């Protein structure tokens, strides 16, 4: 297996990962090559399909012209997976639209056909042994998987031989439960992957490790001191939100209620939903009314993001902030949510001044709501620093970039390519 670690039965949590030796903050516990992975459609042309390296002048696949590579070696190594989509993409044309989950599951089935035996990705936990929670799925979740199965059949019939429907339901459920999203240094979505040994770790809202990525290789580093006998915990979710929001997501997606110290004490809940100190204090009903409103506009914006124009999306963020500000302070996480969304729209519009203003309001509340070594905090420092440098605010840029580096050295390792890249940006402008 993995030296210094062991799989064990964690009471109430199924299987888990336990330390057999001590690990200090910043230590690498283990690394795990991707069992299967896929580059997200929006990042094609910026990243190599095989190894995920970002660079300019990638070689384009001459057949489909929609997959880019470092060189012919990366291209040849990616062929067993790319051929599932190369020709279908041109033949289906505009009508080719399998969801990312379908794309990943197709590559899982292809990997199983080629490499049926245990891989180096599965030293402690195999894909076949993944938890499915099939008995807990409701009809709406089962009907969505069955829709995914139909898409899998529609788009991948010529390259894949399918198991029976029951096996496909289980596999999709296992993917929903154990799959990982890969993000770049700015926490932008890069793709999806299966990391079997990383999937073994249970969840905590005060985790003692963080998962980062070196291309398609997952790495796991301590962000708290870990002693022999202690369970290794990662976070499955965005830790910005209060306990009821976190446990709503964990129950819905992973079918458990978290009992970590943060969930048990709820010690950060009050700061996360901070209320303005008005002459007449807002009543509990009014607070719960604004929280309900906030959750609704968050959902409305998530839908609107697919079709509305950038200026229209900014309008939603502006109006929602105005209404919430009558009750919520700026450090309130529902305010911060819409500010972050507005920043995203500004970054896409290349409105650097607009994005900088939002970043400056977000970073200090982020620092206190998130844990000590949060990737959400590091990436916000990084966005600020790059905005500053781009706008020729060299001194503020350097300060922000160094703040990002200080965190990433712990989470990513001092020798990570991301840290080398960021140091160039300090000594370029």
């Amino acid at each position: 297996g993995l030296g210094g670690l062991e799989r064990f039965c964690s009471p109430g949590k199924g299987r888990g990962l336990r330390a057999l030796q001590p690990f200090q903050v910043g230590d690498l516990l283990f690394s795990c090559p991707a069992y299967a992975y896929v580059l997200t459609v929006n990042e094609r042309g910026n990243h190599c399909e095989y190894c995920f390296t970002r660079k300019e002048g990638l070689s384009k696949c001459g057949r489909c012209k929609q997959a880019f590579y470092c060189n012919v070696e990366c291209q040849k190594e990616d062929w067993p997976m790319h051929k599932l989509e190369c020709s279908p993409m041109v033949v289906f044309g505009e009508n080719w639209n399998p969801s990312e989950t379908v794309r990943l599951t197709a590559r899982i089935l292809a990997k199983q056909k080629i490499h049926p035996e245990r891989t180096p990705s599965e030293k402690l936990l195999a894909v076949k042994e993944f938890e499915s929670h099939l008995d807990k799925l409701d009809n709406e979740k089962k009907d969505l998987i069955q829709s995914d199965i139909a898409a899998l059949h529609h788009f991948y019939s010529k390259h894949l031989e399918f198991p029976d429907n029951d096996s496909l339901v289980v596999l999709f459920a296992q993917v929903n439960c154990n799959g990982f999203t890969i993000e770049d240094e700015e926490l932008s979505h890069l793709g999806s992957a299966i990391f079997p040994d990383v999937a073994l770790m249970n969840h905590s809202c005060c985790p003692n490790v963080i998962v980062t990525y070196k291309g398609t290789l997952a790495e796991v580093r301590a962000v708290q001191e870990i002693k022999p006998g202690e369970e290794v915990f990662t976070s499955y979710i965005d830790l910005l939100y209060p306990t009821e929001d976190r446990n709503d997501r964990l129950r819905d997606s992973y079918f458990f209620t978290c009992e970590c110290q943060e969930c048990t004490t709820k010690d950060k809940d009050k700061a996360k939903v901070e209320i303005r100190k008005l002459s007449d204090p807002p009543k509990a009903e009014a607070i719960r009314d604004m929280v309900r409103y906030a959750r609704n506009v968050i959902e409305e914006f998530r839908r609107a993001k697919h079709y509305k124009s950038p200026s229209e999306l900014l309008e939603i963020c502006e109006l929602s902030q105005e209404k919430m500000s009558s009750v919520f302070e700026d450090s309130n996480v529902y305010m911060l949510h819409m500010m972050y969304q507005a920043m995203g729209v500004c970054l896409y519009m290349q409105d650097w001044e607009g994005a900088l203003q939002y970043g400056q309001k977000i970073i200090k509340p982020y620092s206190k709501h998130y844990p000590l070594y949060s990737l959400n905090v590091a990436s916000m420092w990084l966005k600020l620093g790059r905005l500053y440098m781009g706008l020729e605010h060299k001194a503020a840029g350097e300060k922000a970039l160094k703040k990002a580096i200080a965190i990433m050295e712990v989470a990513h390792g001092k020798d990570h390519p991301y840290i080398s890249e960021i140091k160039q940006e300090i000594e370029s402008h």
Partner: peptide
Amino acid sequence: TLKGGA
């Protein structure tokens, strides 16, 4: 595939 921050 959902496990991750943000």
